[PDB]
Amino acid sequence: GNLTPEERDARTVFCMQLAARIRPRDLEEFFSTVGKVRDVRMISDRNSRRSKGIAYVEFVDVSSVPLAIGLTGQRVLGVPIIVQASQ
Structure with a gap:
């Protein structure tokens, strides 16, 4: 049941240029069209004056x-979202 940190990285994207008001629900919904989302972690302490929030989105499968x-x-x-491989 336990994936290694490296295995989780292989399933995770790093997201940038997120709206100040973004919620995990918004990312869950957005990414649901390309795979099953396992976890969403907001990293940014919201700067309300900037659309530069960040997050990790971890999928079930590497395919996503x-x-x-x-x-x-x-x-x-x-x-416009920016989505990159975590690793």
């Missing part, structure tokens, strides 16, 4: 990572 990266530029709460 390239698909999620491909969503880069799509508008989440009106702001």
Whole structure:
């Protein structure tokens, strides 16, 4: 049941340029179209004056990572998201 940290990294994307008001629910919903989401972790202490929030989104399968990266530029709460491999 336990994945190693490296195995979890292989399933995780790092997200940038998140709207100040973003919620984990918003990321769960957005990424659900490319795979099953296991965990969402907001890293940013919200700067309300900037659309530069960050988060990790961990999927169940490694297959979802390239698909999620491909969503880069799509508008989440009106702001183009940047999605990169965690590792």
